[PDB]
Amino acid sequence: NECISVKGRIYSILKQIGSGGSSKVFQVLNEKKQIYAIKYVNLEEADNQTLDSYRNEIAYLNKLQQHSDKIIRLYDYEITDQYIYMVMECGNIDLNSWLKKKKSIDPWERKSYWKNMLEAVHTIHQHGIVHSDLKPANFLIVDGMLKLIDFGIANQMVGTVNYMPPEAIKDMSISPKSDVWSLGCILYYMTYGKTPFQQIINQISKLHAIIDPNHEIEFPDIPEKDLQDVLKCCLKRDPKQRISIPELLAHPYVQIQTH
């Protein structure tokens, strides 16, 4: 049988996904065979902040669904003092697995996926939310369409610093521009199959190279010249100079039609 209930509904679990500890995400099947995904958080360990973070994540995630189909759908959820059950869209595969998988993405796909990311991220910015932790894993490929799975609000389910922006580090001792840099690192990786500072192994090194104005990032000339410009503009170390989401939505690479 195998049965999970959510506000009075049964779902047949099929397998844990990604995580396995603190929180837990599973693939599932319901009544009309329809396949979904059930995320589960055991609140018997959460602090007020953790708790509040999931509350806040759910609220926003619930509200922003209507503003865009480029954000993972939350069909329902159940919140209790001991647990949280979220019924969400099933994951075909995350942009991260997909990438390190093959290694020759169709230019048209690159651009299509790129438009998806911009839409989703732009949407959260409009409501005052800065993800601040964007990495390829935050995106799920659903029917050829990329969707943002989380908002970076809840401490949702290693630990790279390759997508980290210069300003994040320098300040140590946030802005929408910060999401631009990371989305840039992701596009840059879908363009050169590598991340801007992936070749720098010593961790203390990358962090110094990411902020060093004299550490010129490289941009191997390629056919799609519009793509080359996006990358360069998304990676300007000065956030005030860095292109914005609105400017990006108006950029040739995204506007001019050449399938």
UniProtKB/Swiss-Prot annotation:
Record-listed ATP binding positions: I17, G18, S19, G20, G21, S22, S23, K24, V25, K39
Tissue: Present in rapidly proliferating cell lines.
Domain called Protein kinase: residue spans: 11-254
Active site: D133
Disulfide-bonded cysteines: none
Family according to the record: Belongs to the protein kinase superfamily. Ser/Thr protein kinase family.
Subunit note: Interacts with TPR; the interactions occurs in a microtubule-independent manner. Interacts with MAD1L1 and MAD2L1.
Function comment: Involved in mitotic spindle assembly checkpoint signaling, a process that delays anaphase until chromosomes are bioriented on the spindle, and in the repair of incorrect mitotic kinetochore-spindle microtubule attachments. Phosphorylates MAD1L1 to promote the mitotic spindle assembly checkpoint. Phosphorylates CDCA8/Borealin leading to enhanced AURKB activity at the kinetochore. Phosphorylates SKA3 at 'Ser-34' leading to dissociation of the SKA complex from microtubules and destabilization of microtubule-kinetochore attachments. Phosphorylates KNL1, KNTC1 and autophosphorylates.
Protein name: Dual specificity protein kinase TTK
Gene label: TTK
